[PDB]
Design a protein around this nucleic acid. Structure first.
Ligand SMILES: O=C(CCCCCCCCCO)NCCCC#Cc1cn([C@H]2C[C@H](O)[C@@H](COP(=O)(O)OP(=O)(O)OP(=O)(O)O)O2)c(=O)[nH]c1=O
Ligand SMILES: [Mg+2]
Ligand SMILES: [Mg+2]
Ligand SMILES: [Mg+2]
Ligand SMILES: [Mg+2]
Ligand SMILES: [Mg+2]
Ligand SMILES: [Mg+2]
Length: 539
DNA sequence: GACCACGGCGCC
DNA sequence: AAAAGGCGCCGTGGTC
């Protein structure tokens, strides 16, 4: 390309280099643009940002997030990553996409701009005739990138002082647990080392091995194995308690307060748009899609996520979402009827599990039932189910039979999906998002059957993901108009922040947008809560 | 200081 | 651990 002075003309493709991967934390080291046989390199990258109308190119959203951080309204536009991801969701990195579709991801901005331009050309050509993938690009992925940029640049408020205090309390309880473990072992060792713990449990103490690890075949010390050993030795329960506390402390309580941004005073995640095999988003640096909520300490941590002074959090969560999607995809009359009548399969399963009437089912019990309901749907074994429920194998086997007997057209949809997947090489969501699964034709049964579970899960999980993405794209401009903010997405949940005076109105509108996004053969229902913290907003 | 593979585990 | 699926981050162990 012919070198030309900055600035580029409108429509140019951008290339940029960051000091680190996270756009909220990165220094913009270089900026360039390419169009019409020319490359334009910016002498001063930050000032040069002001010249662009949109970020068009590889990782466009990251540049937009940095621009928004700097107080510039620079929206992301075309991004070859999104085109590539729609063609094949194994396309997740610019290194891989570049190699596959015509170039090399280097560390120079001008080369990145040139690459973006030519990749766009080639990938756009590949989507010619792919009407359904093109619809996803234009109606979902491209506009969603703009929404995600705003979410990333906004961040969420965290009660740092509360977490710092919590750390000190948890540290004292961890000390009590570890001291007991070492007493019971008869000697100290590194309790954080599963290799050292394996030797203590299975060699030094008398305990029976229950299972083996996947890659290296060591005797497992997983929570599932320890659960099976609860009655065998007092050290086991102490280890389980130690694990719960150290997991929460090392992953959330200690690291999060150190990640507050100096300018915004908030915690900023990244929402990765080309990261999963099914079309789900992922969240990283830090992951805010796995904040604890199940246990009492986990709940205390979730309460640290709070609204800005004068604002409230609004949390919205699709009810039984993958079951509703399954009803639509499979067309099972019984399942469709369940949702037309307003029943709750999670509450029903929970009633059976704990042997209590539906009115007696508490939230933790219902959570337990969700694990069981989705476990069974996506192929859990009777053995595993029997162990997790602590019921005889025969009882677990029976539950699985009746589960599918109740909804007969589900297994037929699974078989049809797998057969088409074998022929075409891919399975697809309602909207035509594809996942390639070549191991459907594997000659090794365990491999093939694992592939089958991945394959029939994808249309369900992916359709639910598509629906949420479409809802975000529709909702965002409405929130902007009301002065509200979209903060987080957690798969089938959104967390918004609204001025107190408008929170009730925002909650109502968001619920309606989400429920009416793309009507199915069954109603979509959305549960909504409002609160000063994330935990209180979900109750 | 960094990378990796692994086991393990937090969420959906 | 066991025939649930989908993620990212932890510390360990080993290395570079
Ligand atoms: O926390 C637990 C275990 C509970 C404790 C175990 C027993 C304790 C008993 C104590 C008695 O005193 N389970 C986790 C629950 C959260 C979950 C989940 C999953 C979700 N999905 C998919 C399917 C689901 O539709 C979608 C969104 O998840 P949710 O929003 O949580 O589920 P939902 O939309 O189906 O139901 P809901 O929103 O109406 O609650 O993600 C899965 O595929 N697998 C899961 O395990
Ligand atoms: Mg839900
Ligand atoms: Mg949810
Ligand atoms: Mg209104
Ligand atoms: Mg190891
Ligand atoms: Mg792993
Ligand atoms: Mg699981």
């Amino acid at each position: 390309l012919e070198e030309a002075p900055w600035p580029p003309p409108e429509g140019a493709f951008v290339g940029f280099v960051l000091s680190r991967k996270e756009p909220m934390w990165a220094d913009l080291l270089a900026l360039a643009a390419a169009r019409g046989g020319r490359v334009h390199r910016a002498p001063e990258p930050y000032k040069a940002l002001r010249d662009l109308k949109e970020a068009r190119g590889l990782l466009a959203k990251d540049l937009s997030v940095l621009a928004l951080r700097e107080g510039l309204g620079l929206p992301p536009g075309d991004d070859p990553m999104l085109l590539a991801y729609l063609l094949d969701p194994s396309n997740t990195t610019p290194e891989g996409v570049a190699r596959r579709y015509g170039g090399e991801w280097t560390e120079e901005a001008g080369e990145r701009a040139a690459l973006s331009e030519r990749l766009f050309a080639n990938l756009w050509g590949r989507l010619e005739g792919e009407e359904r993938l093109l619809w996803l690009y234009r109606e979902v992925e491209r506009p969603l990138s703009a929404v995600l940029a705003h979410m990333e640049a906004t961040g969420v408020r965290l009660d740092v002082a509360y977490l710092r205090a919590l750390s000190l309390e948890v540290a004292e309880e961890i000390a009590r647990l570890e001291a007991e473990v070492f007493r019971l072992a008869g000697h100290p060792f590194n309790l954080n080392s599963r290799d050292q713990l394996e030797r203590v449990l299975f060699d030094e103490l008398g305990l029976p091995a229950i299972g083996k690890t996947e890659k290296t075949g060591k005797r497992s010390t997983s929570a599932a194995v320890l659960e099976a050993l609860r009655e065998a030795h007092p050290i086991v329960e102490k280890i389980l308690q130690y694990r719960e506390l150290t997991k929460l402390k090392s992953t959330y309580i200690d690291p999060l307060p150190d990640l507050i941004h100096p300018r915004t005073g908030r915690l900023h995640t990244r929402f990765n748009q080309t990261a999963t095999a099914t079309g789900r988003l992922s969240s990283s640096d830090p992951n805010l899609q796995n904040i604890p909520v199940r246990t009492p300490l986990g709940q205390r941590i979730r309460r640290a996520f709070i609204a800005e002074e004068g604002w409230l959090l609004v949390a919205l969560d699709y009810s039984q979402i993958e079951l509703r999607v399954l009803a639509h995809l499979s067309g099972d009359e019984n399942l469709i009827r369940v949702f037309q009548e307003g029943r709750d399969i999670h509450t029903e399963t929970a009633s059976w599990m704990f042997g209590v009437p539906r009115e007696a089912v508490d939230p933790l019990m219902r959570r337990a039932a969700k694990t069981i309901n989705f476990g069974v749907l996506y192929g859990m074994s009777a053995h595993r189910l029997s162990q997790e429920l602590a019921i005889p194998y025969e009882e677990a086997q029976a539950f699985i039979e009746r589960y599918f007997q109740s909804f007969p057209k589900v297994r037929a949809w699974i078989e049809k999906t797998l057969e088409e997947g074998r022929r075409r090489g891919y399975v697809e969501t309602l909207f035509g998002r594809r996942r390639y699964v070549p191991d459907l034709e594997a000659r090794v049964k365990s491999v093939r059957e694992a592939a089958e579970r991945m394959a029939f899960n994808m249309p369900v999980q992916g359709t639910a993901a598509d629906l949420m993405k479409l809802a975000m794209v529709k909702l965002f401009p409405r929130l902007e108009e009301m002065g509200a903010r979209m903060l987080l997405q957690v798969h089938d949940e959104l967390v918004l922040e609204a001025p107190k005076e408008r929170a009730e109105a925002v909650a109502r509108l968001a619920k309606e947008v989400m429920e009416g996004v793309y009507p199915l053969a069954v109603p979509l229902e959305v549960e909504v809560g409002i609160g000063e913290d994330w935990l209180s907003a979900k109750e």
